[PDB]
Design a protein around this ligand. Structure first.
Ligand SMILES: N[C@@H](CCC(=O)N[C@@H](CS)C(=O)NCC(=O)O)C(=O)O
Ligand SMILES: N[C@@H](CCC(=O)N[C@@H](CS)C(=O)NCC(=O)O)C(=O)O
Lengths: 218, 219
């Protein structure tokens, strides 16, 4: 299994968490977004949307982190605990997956991408507010121990990959979000959490802040 | 007995309406007027703590979120899997397109529309327009086949067209640069239920956002 990837990228780290949970080894091929590696004609052939992650499973090309996670659990999970087959339980996981793509990740990207790639040095107040609203939505979703119920699923891997990044840029206040902090501690009990995700999320937040300051020059 | 907490102006609600028509299902609609804050009540919060529509009530079981609802309906009621394949590779292509709709097409539409509809804004910033125009290109390049996830129509087409048919009325979609998107829109327009389930509401939402933008300027 080959992952076209960059550790700073949240949906990349979502798939790394999944592969660790599944006991799969991934061969990582680095796509340096900061050098434009994803903008080549060769990469475009892999993904016409020119985004990472992309999985190569023995020549079969699977794009998009959520799709990749679902595919890996379906094909290689010894059971379905990370992505239930039961239709109602599965719908709850799917709903949380799309909440991650549509709300958590999208709002993070609306602050990050312009800093990382287009030379911006500001974070508009409305976009901070949009992120804080996404934190409230998440806190209210965490009625159980994990985002899509009492068992940990790929939806948690998706959500934490983003949360562990954006909170270093838009602070996530513990007194106001106790459930999110208890849930982060559950994920930090995983032996592979820091290698698969924690380090990379912390590093992305710091990088965004460092880039914002550097870009302020000239 | 399928009940949908819904508003016909809402894209993800029309994606589910298109899915129910394709499956031959009847939905009882319970109208949720977002402008009146019907989704922000304590009773609605119990249906969905994210307070979004659509929400499905299937004989007492609550299922949130349009893409989840579509997969659920095809899974449970499809006479075969053509709208959401069981094959893991073809399914992955559909899932990738569905998350493209939520993460890219819908998100960028909402980043223009929400502030006008609900928070009184009267402008559309140029950087937001570009974000949407970039999304059109991403979609155009995705459409190498007749439908967004291959040569067969799936729930990913319903999701994508419910947003595209809305945002094109506000951020114009230039035809000369996007022939594949126009050809695809015409394939969906051949469905006998397309206008009723989706078309009219997409057109109405676009005109409604432009009207409300004007209203907000005038106080
Ligand atoms: N829905 C996608 C989002 C992928 C995504 O946006 N990745 C970013 C990096 S975090 C990217 O590749 N950006 C480069 C580009 O959009 O051109 C997923 O979860 O795989
Ligand atoms: N990923 C969700 C998105 C739902 C969504 O944002 N719906 C809007 C109407 S188009 C809504 O209910 N907005 C009210 C709010 O967020 O408070 C889906 O596809 O169901």
């Amino acid at each position: 299994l080959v992952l076209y990837t960059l550790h700073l990228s949240p949906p990349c780290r979502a798939v790394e968490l999944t592969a660790k949970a599944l006991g799969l080894e991934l061969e990582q091929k680095n796509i340096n977004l900061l050098a434009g590696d994803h903008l080549t004609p060769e990469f475009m052939k892999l993904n016409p949307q020119h985004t990472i992650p992309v999985l190569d499973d023995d020549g079969t090309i699977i794009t998009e982190s959520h799709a990749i996670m679902i595919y890996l659990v379906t094909k290689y999970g010894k059971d379905d605990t990370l992505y239930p087959k039961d239709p109602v339980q599965q719908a709850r996981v799917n709903a949380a997956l799309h909440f991650e793509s549509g709300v958590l990740f999208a709002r993070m990207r609306f602050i990050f991408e312009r800093i990382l790639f287009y030379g911006k040095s500001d974070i508009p107040e409305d976009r901070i507010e949009y992120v804080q609203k996404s934190y409230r939505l998440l806190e209210d979703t965490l009625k159980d121990d994990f985002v899509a119920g009492s068992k940990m699923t790929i939806a948690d891997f998706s959500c934490i990959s983003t949360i562990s990044s954006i909170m270093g840029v838009v602070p996530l206040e513990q007194s106001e979000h106790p459930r999110i902090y208890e849930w982060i501690d559950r994920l930090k009990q995983l032996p592979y959490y820091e290698e698969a995700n924690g380090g990379g999320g912390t590093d992305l937040g710091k990088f965004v802040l460092a880039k914002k300051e550097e870009n302020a020059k000239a």
